[PDB]
């Protein structure tokens, strides 16, 4: 799995904060919240990136991958969150969007694969 590194400060066994800015219009990235790993503890789901295109706010952000793990959103822990709160936070009135990004090691979590062939 040829993986090129961008910055040493960025590893796969640590958490790195990700700051963003308010965007406009819809149609863009998508956040998946469908859990199935440990659905034993209701009210405590998690959020992850499902789709993402190059040149998008999340793109220029610096670095993102389909599966990223957000631990905190502008100070909103994954402690019981509605399905309309996250989105609202993405465009919240806040001045800036500061969230924590976590990227565990390869094996802990599965790999997301959306439609599209390969060649």
């Amino acid at each position: 799995t040829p993986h090129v590194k961008d910055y040493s400060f960025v590893t796969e066994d640590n958490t790195f904060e990700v700051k963003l800015f308010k965007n406009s219009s819809g149609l863009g990235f998508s956040f998946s919240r469908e859990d199935n790993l440990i659905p034993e503890q209701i009210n405590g789901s998690i959020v992850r990136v499902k789709k993402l295109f190059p040149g998008q706010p999340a793109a220029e952000s610096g670095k993102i991958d389909v599966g990223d793990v957000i631990l905190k959103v502008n100070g909103a822990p994954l402690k019981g969150l509605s399905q309309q709160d996250v989105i609202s936070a993405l465009r919240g009135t806040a001045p800036e969007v500061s969230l924590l990004l976590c990227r565990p090691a390869p094996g802990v979590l599965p790999e997301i694969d959306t439609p599209g062939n390969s060649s």
Binding site: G28, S30, F31, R33, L90
Partner: peptide, 12 residues
Amino acid sequence: MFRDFDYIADWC
């Protein structure tokens, strides 16, 4: 089992 509770379909 072949069922759920809530779903999602919102993006930006």
